[PDB]
Scaffold this active site. Structure first.
Site, mmCIF file in Angstrom:
data_model
loop_
_atom_site.group_PDB
_atom_site.id
_atom_site.type_symbol
_atom_site.label_atom_id
_atom_site.label_comp_id
_atom_site.label_asym_id
_atom_site.label_seq_id
_atom_site.Cartn_x
_atom_site.Cartn_y
_atom_site.Cartn_z
ATOM 1 N N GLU A 1 33.670 -0.720 -43.752
ATOM 2 C CA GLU A 1 34.168 0.668 -43.600
ATOM 3 C C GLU A 1 34.280 1.186 -42.159
ATOM 4 O O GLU A 1 33.809 2.286 -41.864
ATOM 5 C CB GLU A 1 33.460 1.711 -44.551
ATOM 6 C CG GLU A 1 33.819 1.667 -46.046
ATOM 7 C CD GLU A 1 34.806 2.646 -46.677
ATOM 8 O OE1 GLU A 1 35.413 3.460 -45.942
ATOM 9 O OE2 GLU A 1 34.989 2.580 -47.916
ATOM 10 N N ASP A 2 34.970 0.422 -41.289
ATOM 11 C CA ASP A 2 35.208 0.759 -39.872
ATOM 12 C C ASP A 2 33.951 0.631 -38.967
ATOM 13 O O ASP A 2 33.848 1.302 -37.936
ATOM 14 C CB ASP A 2 35.960 2.113 -39.676
ATOM 15 C CG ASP A 2 37.463 2.138 -39.985
ATOM 16 O OD1 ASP A 2 38.216 1.329 -39.378
ATOM 17 O OD2 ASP A 2 37.901 3.041 -40.746
#
Ligand SMILES: [Mg+2]
Ligand SMILES: [Zn+2]
Ligand SMILES: [Zn+2]
Ligand SMILES: [Zn+2]
Lengths: 56, 84, 46, 33, 263, 65, 56, 134
Positions: free
Chosen positions: H3-4
């Site tokens: 997630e980044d």
DNA sequence: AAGT
RNA sequence: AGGA
DNA sequence: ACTTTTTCCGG
């Protein structure tokens, strides 16, 4: 709006968030520095007294 | 005005909010060095104690359920069903 | 020993006191630096 | 003849010193080339 | 001869190419790990700076000094500072290096790892000499000075492992490979038209036998034979990065066996 | 800004190889590809370290005190 | 922002090193947080009562 | 790295990867009050005022300045200054409570007026840690 | 961008 | 003036 | 003729 419906509060902390697959759904990783600053007021009771003094 | 026990019409079951406020209230009292109504079988957390007090329906509190008109139904944590 | 303040461009040591004028001697330039502490700093090599 | 205030000069302009300055001159002037 | 076999392919001051046969993968990998981060070396770990008139900052140079590789041959006869009894350091646990440099020259004056001088007593053991692999015998370039730029500082090198800081890295890259013809089906080759065409063949393909398609998948097959190559930074000599690794791991296992006996 | 000692990725001592690289280019008239490889930098992590280095120190030295 | 009842949820503290609030990946969606530099708030209840409200 | 997020090689960080310097220049000046009622760059103590910062004034030298070698940290006083009244009120500039580092350059100059002008640079290295953006 |  |  | 809102957080 700014002082009554909304308010700046104490016992509040904020930091960058990062994902952890080893944490449980319902848990939040709290950095030591923040846990060491944030403080819960516990009442001295016969159940806690002993633990409490050790923390004191 | 106060609704008589024989004329009560609310849930025989306890609300999610009633249960959450009873455990909070008993935990606050148990923590304020209140008399505990059950054998704390090794128990040291006032919430866990309060949960146990409730488990054996041994909490001496009474929920006053208010109606939109002001009239109310008094229900004991003893009589309230905890299905939840 | 003793070099209180060093001039910023010519780098000639001054050693002036409070009320001895903030200016260099030969050139003007009031810039003047501070010359590192004799209480020596140590750093870990990481 | 008469003084009429002070005009802020833009760096590297005709009226700025740096325009008329070489790599060596700039480095000497403590200015980044 | 015994249990796991070794067959060294190529050897040098900096590199050992060999083949580890009749070994468990878990064993050859635990060995890979150990050589990267568990063999002790010696490097600068405290830099008391006296004068710095350089273009670089005190700590920039500090960090640099730790990366300079120091002789860690007879490292085994130097105590870990923690285990020594002196407040701070001594000759038993540390090597003390001094570095003085100044731009006398009108040209740019260079500051090399050769410009380091051991001030501590070496107790006649092989340690703290900056590794100079360089042809012109200069070693690492620490700095550069113009004129009045002086560099004065004292350094204390200590034991430590790469697990604590990558500066105590005895080895550079460790080449590890197994099964150059994927006969184990330990990988699924991504492709566009042909797996075999698009994927380049290993050099180790020569030392193993090609699959020969007209044969079923050997599920029974296990991974042994590990075409490896260890690179020394300079501190410990190549062979010793291996031997010392083998030993270090044995010592870890022994500590378990020993700690088990305490209970 | 001054040649990094040891390649970030693998750790091969690289601070020595600088002037030698700058010489295999100027004096020896070689290309960057052959120069890096003469210096024995085979893994691209080591190669990139020298290849992509910007020796800014030299500009800082041009300033007086 | 907090346009959801699920944008504010109660969690178990887990004291950990490093300066980030760590959080399970499945709880990513309700908050709407990514880990691209997103920050988050943490409020601490002071009563054994305000605690029950959070936990229950 | 979900997630980044992203996994960074710790071994690399140590070898010098993504390390950076950081500077912050604290500045001050002696202010003149009409009847030549100036402020003073000095190291204060008690002396009637008692309106001084909690940080160790001890890193200061007699001119009310740190020297360019000193490792500073909490709200350690970087510039000691005082203002008297109709006496040593404190006017000391401490290091940003959040910050910490080593004094780099201390510059003592003159204001156009002719007032004591001071600029203090504080250096720190920042190593790539866990919440760090890239 | 709407609406007394 | 800047982040999500 | 005439007014008021618009996501959340270093100087
Ligand atoms: Mg995001
Ligand atoms: Zn001068
Ligand atoms: Zn010792
Ligand atoms: Zn490399």
């Amino acid at each position: 709006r700014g002082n009554l419906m909304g308010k700046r509060v104490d016992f509040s902390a904020r930091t960058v968030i990062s994902g952890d697959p080893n944490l449980e759904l319902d848990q939040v990783g709290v950095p030591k520095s923040i846990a060491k600053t944030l403080t819960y007021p516990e009442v001295v009771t016969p159940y806690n007294i002993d633990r409490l003094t050790q923390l004191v | 005005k106060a609704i008589p026990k024989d004329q009560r019409a609310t849930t025989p079951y306890m609300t999610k909010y009633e249960r959450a406020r009873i455990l909070g209230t008993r935990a606050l009292q148990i923590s304020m060095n209140a008399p505990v109504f059950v054998d704390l079988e090794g128990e040291t957390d006032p919430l866990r104690i309060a949960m146990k007090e409730l488990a054996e329906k041994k909490i001496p509190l009474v929920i006053r359920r208010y109606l939109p008109d002001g009239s109310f139904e008094d229900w004991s944590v003893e009589e309230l069903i905890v299905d939840l | 020993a003793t070099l209180k303040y060093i001039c910023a461009e010519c780098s000639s040591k001054l050693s002036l006191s409070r009320t001895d004028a903030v200016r260099c001697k030969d050139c003007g330039h009031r810039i003047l630096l501070k010359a590192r502490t004799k209480r020596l700093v140590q750093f870990e090599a990481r | 003849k008469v003084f009429i205030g002070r005009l802020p000069i833009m760096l590297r302009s005709k009226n700025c010193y740096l325009s008329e300055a070489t790599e060596s001159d700039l480095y000497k002037l403590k200015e980044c080339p | 001869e015994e249990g796991p076999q070794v067959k060294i392919r190529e050897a040098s001051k900096d590199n050992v190419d060999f083949i580890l046969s009749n070994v468990d993968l878990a064993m050859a990998n635990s060995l890979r790990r150990v050589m990267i981060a568990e063999i002790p070396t010696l490097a600068i770990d405290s830099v008391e700076v006296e004068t710095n008139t350089t273009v670089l900052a005190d700590e920039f140079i500090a960090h640099r000094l730790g990366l300079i590789p120091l002789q860690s041959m007879d490292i085994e006869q130097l105590e870990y500072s923690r285990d020594c009894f002196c407040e701070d350091h001594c000759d038993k646990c540390s090597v003390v290096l001094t570095l003085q440099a100044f731009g006398e020259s009108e040209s740019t004056t260079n500051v090399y790892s050769k410009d380091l001088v051991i001030v501590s007593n070496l107790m006649g053991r092989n340690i703290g000499h900056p590794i100079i692999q360089d042809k012109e015998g200069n070693g690492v370039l620490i700095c550069k000075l113009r004129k009045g730029q002086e560099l004065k500082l004292t350094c204390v090198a200590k034991k430590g492992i790469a697990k604590e800081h990558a500066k105590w890295g005895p080895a550079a890259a460790i080449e590890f490979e197994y099964d150059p013809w994927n006969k184990l089906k330990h990988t699924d080759y991504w492709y566009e038209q042909d797996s075999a065409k698009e994927w380049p063949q290993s050099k180790n393909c020569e030392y193993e036998d090609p699959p020969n398609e007209g044969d079923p998948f050997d599920y029974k097959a296990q991974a042994d034979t590990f075409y490896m190559n260890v690179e020394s930074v300079g501190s410990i000599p190549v062979d010793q990065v291996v031997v010392r690794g083998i030993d270090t791991l044995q010592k870890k296992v022994a500590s378990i066996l020993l700690a088990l006996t305490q209970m | 800004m001054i040649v990094p000692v040891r390649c970030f990725s693998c750790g091969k001592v690289v601070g020595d190889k600088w002037e030698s690289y700058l010489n295999l280019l100027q004096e020896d008239e070689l290309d960057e590809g052959t120069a890096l490889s003469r210096l024995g930098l085979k893994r691209y992590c080591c190669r990139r370290m020298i290849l992509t280095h910007v020796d800014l120190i030299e500009k800082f030295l041009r300033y007086n005190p | 922002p907090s346009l959801h009842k699920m944008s504010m949820m109660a969690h178990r503290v887990k004291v950990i090193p490093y300066s980030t609030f760590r959080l399970n990946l499945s709880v990513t969606s309700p908050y709407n947080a990514d880990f691209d530099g997103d920050e988050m708030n943490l409020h601490v209840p002071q009563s054994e009562e305000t605690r029950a409200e959070l936990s229950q | 790295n979900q997630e980044d997020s992203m996994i960074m090689n710790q071994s690399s960080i140590d070898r010098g990867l993504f390390r950076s310097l950081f500077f912050r220049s604290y500045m001050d000046q002696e202010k003149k009050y009409g009847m030549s009622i100036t402020e003073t760059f000095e190291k204060p103590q008690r002396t009637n005022t008692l309106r001084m910062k909690h940080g160790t004034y001890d890193k200061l030298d007699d001119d009310g300045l740190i020297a360019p070698g000193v490792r500073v940290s909490g709200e350690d006083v970087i510039i000691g200054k005082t203002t008297p009244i109709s006496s040593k009120r404190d006017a000391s500039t401490p290091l940003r409570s959040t910050e910490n580092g080593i004094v780099d350059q201390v510059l003592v100059t003159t204001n156009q007026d002719g007032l004591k002008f001071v600029k203090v640079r504080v250096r720190t290295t920042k190593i790539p840690q866990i919440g760090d953006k890239f």
